[PDB]
Design a protein around this ligand. Structure first.
Ligand SMILES: CCn1cc2c3c(cc(C(=O)N[C@@H](Cc4ccccc4)C(O)(O)CNC4CCOCC4)cc31)N(C)S(=O)(=O)CC2
Length: 372
């Protein structure tokens, strides 16, 4: 009953239906493994179709404390409180959780996105104002019998969030696990990067400067500058049969082809090798251009198919965003401090190539790839 409980629009996040308050007020909430605050629109905004009305909830409790949360894109401020929360197409339970009632925001809500709030699924360590503000998933686990794990199958878009377990109908092949290095963001270690099978040949610490994370709330694969530049050079070289404006590689301009003629085969596969559970072992996840060239729907341009380059630069380390998670079944196994990856039932592939999760791989180099 939890399958296909996620919806969204390409590039604008995936959301799950939730209710807050008594009587229940239904809101669509973006699923975000890259933050740890549960927050909902709580005042009128041009891009909000609806919002949380605290005055109408008898179970609402004001904590008399403001909070401000900045993201890479957007920011908001609001009032902290607690109230009853349920998930209609998730586990049938009711929990009392912290909620930030957003009363002011800047470049956060997105014109026509269909969500009104955000569910930060990361750990308390990064919650605002501080780690004493217990995150929603922690409250869910403490107050119910739900196992300490969830999984995300991100595929107008759709997908599934399976709370408390693993749904085997959602993936094929093996689940490979990489350790969660530190419990704040979902931090992992990348040990190797290849572009069409060619190693970027970089000290692996560069891939994890200064942390690498799995972040469903960020669209792009975001890379440290040194890695971004090397990857772009390699993708340019592989695709050199066609030349694109510099602005494209900067995500500042679309590339378009006549409908149905997108030359997928001139763009390389990208393989990210993640640290395994055993010393000097790794596995790789392989990303097709259908993932990192993100479709931009626009009827005005619809004689063509157009795309944005969904790999970009970061000054805070690697962010494996939605375009990386798409077509993989990703298990956030908090109980065992590990992240699992498998090919999902909605995997990306054409008749020549396919997204993959494969291992084991071994390196003789004993260096630890963690930056700190
Ligand atoms: C979904 C809307 N959206 C589109 C883009 C893009 C983007 C970044 C973000 C972004 O900051 N995501 C927020 C959640 C959020 C979701 C919807 C609207 C606003 C915010 C987060 O919590 O997940 C960040 N997590 C941290 C990131 C840094 O490392 C620590 C964790 C969102 C983006 N980029 C900067 S991008 O992907 O490069 C360009 C496009």
């Amino acid at each position: 009953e939890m399958v296909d409980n996620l919806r969204g629009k390409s590039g604008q996040g995936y959301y799950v239906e939730m209710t807050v308050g008594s009587p229940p007020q239904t809101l669509n909430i973006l699923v975000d493994t890259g933050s740890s605050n549960f927050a909902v629109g709580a005042a009128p905004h041009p891009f909000l179709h609806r919002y949380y009305q605290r005055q109408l909830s008898s179970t609402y409790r004001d904590l008399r404390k403001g909070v401000y949360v900045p993201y890479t894109q957007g920011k908001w401020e609001g009032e902290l409180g607690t109230d009853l929360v349920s998930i209609p197409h998730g586990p049938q339970v009711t929990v009392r959780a912290n909620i930030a009632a957003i009363t002011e925001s800047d470049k956060f809500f997105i014109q026509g996105s269909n969500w009104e709030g955000i569910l930060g699924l990361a750990y308390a360590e990064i919650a605002r104002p501080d780690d004493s503000l217990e995150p929603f998933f922690d409250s869910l686990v403490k107050q119910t019998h739900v196992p300490n794990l969830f999984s995300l199958q991100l595929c107008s878009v759709g997908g599934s969030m399976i709370i408390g377990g693993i749904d085997h109908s959602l993936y094929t092949g093996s689940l490979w696990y990489t350790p969660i290095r530190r419990e704040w963001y979902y931090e992992v270690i990348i040990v190797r990067v290849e572009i069409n099978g060619q190693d970027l040949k970089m000290d692996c610490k560069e891939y994890n400067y200064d942390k690498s994370i799995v972040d469903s709330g960020t669209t792009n694969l975001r890379l440290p500058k040194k890695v971004f530049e090397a990857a772009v050079k390699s993708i340019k070289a592989a695709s050199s049969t066609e030349k694109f404006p510099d602005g494209f590689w900067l995500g500042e301009q679309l590339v378009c082809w006549q409908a149905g003629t997108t030359p997928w085969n001139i763009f390389p596969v990208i393989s990210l090798y993640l640290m395994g559970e055993v010393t000097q072992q790794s596995f790789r996840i392989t990303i097709l251009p259908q993932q990192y060239l993100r479709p931009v729907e626009d009827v005005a341009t619809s004689q063509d198919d157009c795309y944005k380059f969904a790999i970009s630069q970061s000054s805070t380390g690697t962010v494996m965003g939605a375009v990386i998670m798409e077509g993989f079944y990703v298990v956030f196994d908090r109980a065992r401090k590990r992240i699992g990856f498998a090919v999902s039932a909605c995997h990306v592939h054409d008749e020549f190539r396919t997204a993959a999760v494969e291992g084991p791989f071994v390196t003789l180099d004993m260096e630890d790839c963690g930056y700190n």
